[PDB]
Design brief:
part of a larger assembly, 2 chains, A: little secondary structure, 0% strand, rod-shaped, B: alpha+beta, two-stranded antiparallel sheet, two-stranded parallel ribbon, 1 helix, globular, virus, Bacteriophage capsid, YSD1_17, YSD1_16
Chain lengths: 51, 63
């Protein structure tokens, strides 16, 4: 705080302000198609000969 | 030839200081005639007011 001889008026002190930030999200769309070509052949845990 | 800017009075000192130090002083008011420290060739009352015909600072008389 400023030093002032006790006759004179005084000193005035400045101040500060604000800031802002904004954001927007991004959009994600993965997918799969399923044929009969993917369903039919053998999933690995299945016995030989007859599925 | 040309009057130096030391020859235009502005303030009245409030507390003493040396050169290199800074001084609080008065810029406006109504002041005593005799408490202020003038110098020579500026003795009478009329010249002391003609120093400050224009400013905020006016130099009056006590009763």
């Amino acid at each position: 705080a400023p030093f002032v001889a006790p006759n004179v008026q005084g000193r005035v002190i400045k101040e500060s302000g604000y800031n802002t930030k904004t954001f927007k999200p991004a959009y994600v769309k993965p997918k799969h198609v399923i044929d009969p070509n993917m369903i039919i052949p053998r999933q690995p845990g299945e016995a030989l000969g007859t599925g | 030839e040309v009057p130096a800017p030391q020859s235009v009075a502005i303030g009245i000192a409030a507390q003493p200081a040396k050169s290199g130090q800074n001084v609080p002083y008065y810029i406006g008011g109504v002041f005593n005639h005799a408490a202020l420290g003038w110098h020579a060739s500026l003795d009478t009352l009329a010249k002391r007011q003609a120093v400050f015909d224009r400013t905020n600072i006016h130099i009056g008389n006590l009763y």
